[PDB]
Design a protein around this ligand. Sequence first.
Ligand code: NA
Lengths: 114, 114
Amino acid sequence: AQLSSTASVTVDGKDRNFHIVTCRQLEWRRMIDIGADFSGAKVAVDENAQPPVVESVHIQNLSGFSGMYSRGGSGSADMSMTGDKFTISGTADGYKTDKPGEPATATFKIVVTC
Amino acid sequence: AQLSSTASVTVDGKDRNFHIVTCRQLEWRRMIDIGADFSGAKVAVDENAQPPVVESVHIQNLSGFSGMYSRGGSGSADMSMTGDKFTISGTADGYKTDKPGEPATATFKIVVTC
Ligand code: NA
C-alpha cells in the first residue's frame, strides 16, 4: 500500500494485498475501488469535509468476509492520510463466507494508495 | 408494504413478509432496516438524487440468501416511490445459504413502507 495503486485490506486479522486499484472522482465523492466486483473493497470518501469523512465501505468476498457500512448506519469507518496513503479503519456488518446464514461484524483496515 | 412499517422482500422468487421496519434519516440519506440483523435487509437510499437512487442493499439470511448490492460495477438496482411506498429492484451478489462457498447472484424486490 506504499507503492502507487496498491492496497492492503485486513479483516479480523487476515490480510489480502492488491495491485489492482482504481480511484475516481465522482463528484462530490472520491471513489476507491480495490480488486474486482467479485472480490474487493469499494470506499466512498467525502474529501471536502474537514476532517474528511468516509461515506461508505463495501467489502466483498475478502479474507472470507463480505460487509456493508453506510454513514448513519451500524458499524463505523474513520480515515487518515499519510502522504498519499489512505487508511480507512472501522467495523462492518455482513457475513463470513464459511457461514453465510449467520451475522458477522468484522473489524477492517484498508490501506491504499491511488 | 401495504400498511405502515411493513415490507415484502422477494429473492429469486421466494418471498418473506415483515412487520418489523425501522427507518432513519441522515441529511440526504434514508436508511431502511427490514426485519432483524439475523434475517432481514438494510437499504440505503440517496434522496438528494433526482430521482432518488439506491446506494446499497445488504440482504442477510433472507429467503435462503445473503448478499450485497452497492452502486457501481456489474450489480445494479433501480427504485421508485409511490406515495409512502418504496419499490426497489435489483441484483445482489452473495451466497445461497444451501450452498456455502459457491458465489451466487440473486434478483431481489423490496416493497417497503416506513
Ligand atoms: Na455494484
